[PDB]
């Protein structure tokens, strides 16, 4: 009799690399490099028409962001301004701090402003056809008695968390607008803690017309640690805070600017979430979560069967 | 492979064997047949699954890192951030390349090894009752019906039963 020993083979073999050979066919292999994303980021908070900065200021249309908490803030390219024209001298730094902090927890505070009128509004910032303003900000103007006395107010921090105060300075278009709004000319703001300060002198002049306004507001911020305190000092043009945002001690979040629409996935890339079954990935060097490691190869086949020897 | 069975003294694989990775083909008085060997098949599969278990579904969590794309020229610090990331990627790309080349060489060698072990085990079973024809086939020097072939495949073959018949056939003129 005859007894033959043997092994299987397949018609559809796969080429793999080994130590001694660039191209050897095995019966089966599996891919070790993840090369695709489904194009969506599967805790996300969609800013929709509000970028993270008007979100923080509380512009019209941003109320849906109140109380929001996120791992990744999704900021949209088609976001638009809906309020009084503004700029932020260190724009990208403020945007970083808000995004990294990862929540909009606002704590209202009562500021005992003196003599001056509060809650100034504007046609550039309409809410349901009524003149309005940033709902986190408080536009101070002169009294009906044409008075704007020096403001001198203090907020002490003996909570157990650092406070973020966002405040601004208004730049009128003309001397008339300056006096009509704040009496005094020039205005001036100084905001300070024990160890830091910011001082701003308004700059009067014509800027391009935006929503019917030639003036601008420049926004600033102050962080107040526990055991520190903040002092607001003004003879005009202050856009006052209505309180502060809470800062997490540990800041672990970030922001992603994309038009891609919003599932469950542990690994996030700017291209979208990717499966993490594979040890490596070729999608993006930027990742968040339990992710395969980024490599330069587009493919890496691991043999999962014997050498394929047909005939 | 380093043992010289697969793509070696075994000329080619069997596409018609779809119930196992290794097996037996026989020809006797009752006909020609094929049967898979489950133990050697499973031994190879277990080792490959062991490799997969080390590689599949074991990624590591990273959260806040450094920036890796830049919109403005900055010089020194940005040069350093870019260089750090480029260094890291090249070292991981190396690790990945070597891992696959090494595991694959080993997978091809372990599967060749399992084939060789099955052949060696079968050879010892047959004792003086058969001769190796050099192509993975044994010439069995006695009448071996289906149950006899089956006894070889399942490790119950008693060589003493056939030894006299086999020796007379092997050693003659």
């Amino acid at each position, epitope marked *: 009799a005859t007894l033959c020993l043997g092994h299987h083979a397949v018609p559809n073999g796969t080429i793999v690399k080994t130590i001694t050979n660039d191209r050897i066919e095995v019966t089966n292999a599996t891919e070790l490099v993840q090369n695709s994303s489904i194009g969506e980021i599967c805790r996300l908070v969609d800013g929709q028409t509000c970028d993270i900065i008007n979100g923080a200021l509380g512009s019209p249309g941003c109320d849906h962001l109140n109380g929001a908490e996120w791992d990744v803030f999704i900021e949209r390219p088609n976001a638009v301004d809906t309020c009084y024209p503004f700029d932020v001298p260190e724009y990208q730094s403020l945007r970083s701090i808000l995004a990294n902090n990862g929540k909009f927890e606002f704590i209202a505070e009562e500021f005992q402003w003196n003599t001056v009128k509060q809650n100034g509004k504007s046609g550039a910032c309409k809410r349901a056809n009524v003149d309005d303003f940033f709902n986190r900000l408080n536009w101070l103007v002169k009294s009906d008695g044409n008075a704007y006395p020096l403001q001198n107010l203090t907020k002490i921090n003996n909570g157990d968390y650092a406070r973020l105060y966002i405040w601004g300075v208004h730049h009128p278009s003309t001397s008339t607008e300056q006096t009509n709004l704040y009496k005094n000319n020039p205005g001036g703001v100084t905001v300070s803690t024990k160890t830091s300060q910011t001082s701003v002198v308004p700059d009067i002049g014509s800027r391009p017309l935006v929503r019917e306004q030639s003036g601008r507001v420049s926004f600033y911020w102050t962080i107040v640690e526990p055991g520190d305190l903040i002092v607001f000092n003004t003879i005009g043009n202050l856009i006052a805070p209505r309180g502060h945002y809470k800062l997490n001690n540990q800041k672990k979040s970030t922001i992603l600017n994309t038009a891609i629409p919003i599932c469950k996935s542990e690994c996030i890339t700017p291209n979208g979430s990717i499966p993490n079954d594979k040890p490596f990935q070729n999608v993006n060097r930027i990742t968040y979560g339990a992710c395969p490691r980024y490599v330069k190869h587009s493919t890496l086949k691991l043999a999962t069967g014997m050498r394929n020897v047909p005939e | 492979g380093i043992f010289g069975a697969i793509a070696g003294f075994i000329e080619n694989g069997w596409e018609g064997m779809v119930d196992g990775w290794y097996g037996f083909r026989h020809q006797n008085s009752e006909g020609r047949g094929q049967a898979a060997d489950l133990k050697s098949t*499973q031994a190879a*599969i*277990d080792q490959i699954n062991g490799k997969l278990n080390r590689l*599949i579904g074991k990624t590591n969590e990273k959260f806040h890192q450094i920036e890796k794309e830049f919109s403005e020229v900055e010089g020194r610090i940005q040069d350093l951030e870019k260089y750090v990331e480029d260094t890291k990627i090249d070292l991981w790309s190396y690790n990945a390349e070597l891992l696959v080349a090494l595991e694959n060489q080993h997978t091809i060698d372990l599967t060749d090894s399992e084939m060789n072990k099955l052949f060696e085990k079968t050879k010892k079973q047959l004792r003086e009752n058969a001769e190796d024809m050099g192509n993975g086939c044994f010439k069995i020097y006695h009448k071996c019906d289906n149950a006899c072939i089956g006894s070889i495949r399942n490790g119950t073959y008693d060589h003493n039963v056939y030894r006299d018949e086999a020796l007379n056939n092997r050693f003659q003129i």
Partner: antibody, heavy 131, light 107 residues
Framework: EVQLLESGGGLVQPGESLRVSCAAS????????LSWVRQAPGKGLEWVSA????????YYADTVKGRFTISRDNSQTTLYLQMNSLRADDTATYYC????????????????????????WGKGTTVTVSS | EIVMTQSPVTLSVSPGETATLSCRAS??????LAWYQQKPGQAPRLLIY???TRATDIPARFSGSGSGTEFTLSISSLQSDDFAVYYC?????????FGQGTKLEIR
């Protein structure tokens, strides 16, 4: 529907044998693995053994390493478990449980993937070992 | 040969609150880890497998996480019918082991 039904069990004197059947009915083509898990009222779960393909398991817990033996009859689609040399602590509600593995494992459909999780549990058969 | 210890033995959680469970495991284990919901007088039911991947057609309030040694199981929105006992298994040592069990209470 992937339900299985456990038959047999009952009261036995310590030292005797008893085999429990598990009629694997439904979606299970019975090229997938099956397992036995026992639980005594007043105690938690404990994995007993497993079966794969044909004779690939051979997988028994250390408590029953030399006593229990697992049979599989794919022709009649029934899983067995011969419990010999039963002791007092063997009194438990023996559950027959399905076994599933991640699709990356289980290369050959018949053989054992050494990483299984039980998804579909059975009704269970109570076995009491006393005097 | 690889012991599993759940903590605590029993926990009391008001309905609606999130109940976090523990499944500490000696020696490393990541690939395979399955959670179960064994209601009294019934067979165990698979909830999560691997570590975080939940079973088919089970509520999204059952969350799973963990790595290597420490593993957790959190039930988001709790219901009065969740008074079951929960267990966790592991790979592999060619010998799977179960957990001790965590009793969940609901006034």
């Amino acid at each position: 529907e992937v339900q299985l039904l456990e038959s047999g069990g009952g009261l036995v004197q310590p030292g005797e044998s008893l085999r429990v059947s598990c009629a694997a009915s439904g979606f299970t083509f019975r090229d997938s693995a099956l397992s036995w898990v026992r639980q005594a009222p007043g105690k938690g779960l404990e994995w007993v053994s497993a079966i794969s393909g044909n004779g690939g398991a051979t997988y028994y817990a250390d408590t029953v390493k030399g006593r229990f033996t697992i049979s599989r009859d794919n022709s009649q689609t029934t899983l067995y478990l011969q419990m010999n040399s039963l002791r007092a602590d063997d009194t438990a509600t023996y559950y027959c449980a399905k076994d599933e593995s991640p699709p990356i494992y289980n290369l050959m459909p018949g053989y054992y993937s050494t990483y299984y999780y039980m998804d579909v549990w059975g009704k269970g058969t109570t076995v009491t070992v006393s005097s | 040969e690889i012991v599993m210890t759940q903590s605590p033995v029993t926990l009391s959680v008001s309905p609606g609150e999130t109940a976090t469970l523990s499944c500490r495991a000696s020696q490393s284990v990541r690939s395979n880890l399955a959670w179960y919901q064994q209601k009294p007088g019934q067979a165990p039911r698979l909830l999560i497998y691997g570590a975080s991947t939940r079973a088919t057609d089970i509520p999204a309030r059952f969350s799973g996480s963990g790595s290597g040694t420490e593993f957790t199981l959190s039930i988001s929105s709790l219901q009065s019918d969740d008074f079951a006992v929960y267990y966790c298994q592991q790979y592999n040592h060619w010998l799977r082991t179960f957990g001790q069990g965590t009793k969940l209470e609901i006034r």
